[PDB]
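Notebook B, p. 112. Complex prediction, attempt 2.
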Amino acid sequence: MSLQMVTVGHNIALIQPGFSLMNFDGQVFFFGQKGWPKRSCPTGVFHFDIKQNHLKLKPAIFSKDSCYLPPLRYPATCSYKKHQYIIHGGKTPNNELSDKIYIMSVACKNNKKVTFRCTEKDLVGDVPEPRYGHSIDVVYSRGKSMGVLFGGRSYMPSTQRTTEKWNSVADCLPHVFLIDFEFGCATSYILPELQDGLSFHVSIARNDTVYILGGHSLASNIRPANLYRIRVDLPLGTPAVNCTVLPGGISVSSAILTQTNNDEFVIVGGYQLENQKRMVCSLVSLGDNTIEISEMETPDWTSDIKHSKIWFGSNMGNGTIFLGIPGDNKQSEAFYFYTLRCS
Amino acid sequence: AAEFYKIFQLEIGEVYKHPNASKEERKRWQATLDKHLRKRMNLKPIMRMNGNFARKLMTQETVDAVCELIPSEERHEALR
Amino acid sequence: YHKMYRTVKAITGRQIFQPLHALRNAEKVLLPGYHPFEWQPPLKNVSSRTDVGIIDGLSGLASSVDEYPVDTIAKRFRYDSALVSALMDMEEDILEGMRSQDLDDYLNGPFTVVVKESCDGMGDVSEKHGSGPAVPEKAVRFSFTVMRITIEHGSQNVKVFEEPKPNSELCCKPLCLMLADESDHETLTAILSPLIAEREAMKSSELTLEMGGIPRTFKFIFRGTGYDEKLVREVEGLEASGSVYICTLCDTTRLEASQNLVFHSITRSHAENLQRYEVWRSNPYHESVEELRDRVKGVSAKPFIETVPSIDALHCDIGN
Ligand SMILES: [Ca+2]
Ligand SMILES: [Zn+2]
């Protein structure tokens, strides 16, 4: 529950709400900047390093064969098992959506420098539509690892779009998609147990299930206190997907996930209502087939957090969460960044 | 009105219990006071203060909005 | 005006000036969204209503707490409605121009209209107090001007109306006013993309309008010349500030620009910029950062406005 203020270098005008933080072998990096890539960092990734509560952003060069990807403003985070990192879709800085897939990897690493390898893949079959705010995660069933996708928010189809409502968004179809990374395949699956959409939710991994809890549905302008547990197996034939509604779910959207200990994750932040903020923390203790959400003591927030309207952040991976508060008007430096420690 | 604005800045941090403060803490106090003033009474932060700012800041809603950021109640009643 | 009207009426006894509500009623004839117009073929993704007026420039952008925060105020007209009103404001002018060239009056040939697109941001605009988001103290304006109107007569093309003073304040008709910052790219694209969509739809269609008792059809060609160098670079590609690549019309680097500077050719366009951005994003030849930049010739972003490769004389004089 440690709350430490962090200072930032000469790149504070380069972090925007909706970023993503990736942890590679104990090193935390950055993605999803504000504005198009400059001449200082043509790639777009950064060396997210905090020492003595001071933040410095050094550029990180890609490999020779990597693809220079645009800054996704709201991607989907995945951590495949060789240790790679997968992002799907999101908003480009020009505010168009993408239906493309990228996989992060380290091509080569030397003294105090790192080179990435981002690959390009095309999905065939039931290709999901471009969207943002969704959640992706992978499961390990019967010795086979295969990722699952859930709906989010997307623009109106290319048939009902008008310029006067060009930027109006509608929640994606309740369909649940299965992603096979090693082959680039996807077969759609419609499940009657999921009737409404769900956006800005958190995804928790396990051996053969994903626990989606909380989230915002735009159609009814409500945040359900629901909790779905999706169990997927990998037989010889077509995969079988089962969704079961569980009791005890919480009603939070755009929360932050962290992995503090094995079989122990903590939820902090988010919004309960449009004008309300998540002031409490939920400790989710996983098990073989059991989930028990309990309320742990509220960390000591500051006045700036308790009185602000917005916060945003991503996952450090090492039991740390990096959340920021809008500093002030542009006219300190337009953003106040904090760090949070969970045991 | 400028003097009352400075009083509010030093009161939203309880300097009567912290006689020593750094520049960064006072800048944070400035930022949070400006943010809450905008949120509640719809006043923008300005570098040279006008008379309209004085007339609007000299209201009871001003001390209400400033005081709900002050953890103590003695400061609340004193400012009121 | 009300004070003037009241005092003139009180002194003279008669009603020389008209009342404010009469002026407001007479106002609607000129504002967009009063005349009936039909598109053939119908515009893609553009509604066919003929009663659209001052619509929000945010284009129905999300403003909830769970998504990207928006802190801008924008009001804009539909491009087609604005051009309909602009054409009807010069109805008698077009008739006079057609008469003066010894053509007919009820001729309904397809008019080839060229419209210059101008957009420039501003600074030092004070923010008001009052309800609204934390809107920054900068403004960006989008406006269009009507240079020339030509009708097809015989085998050649004849001219009708030419703007006598193109650089005047009496012909820069506003189209979209947003009080945001041109340095920001996300908000600029979010507010300005629908107008580009309408422009692209209008680029491949024809408009029918009851022009002075006889229906006549219009075709439109657009030129985005009214941009300064910084906005051109920030919109259609190349990096800001001063790079190794300089010109917006050719692939000349700074060193050979200093060397030769007499022999060149215009090469850049918008389709070429899009193709080069695709090359940059995909890297088909598996090249490192420096050689990939040399291959892509400086573009490292997705362009979204077709800007004509021209030069701005005012800023040219200022810089020179
Ligand atoms: Ca200017
Ligand atoms: Zn040139």
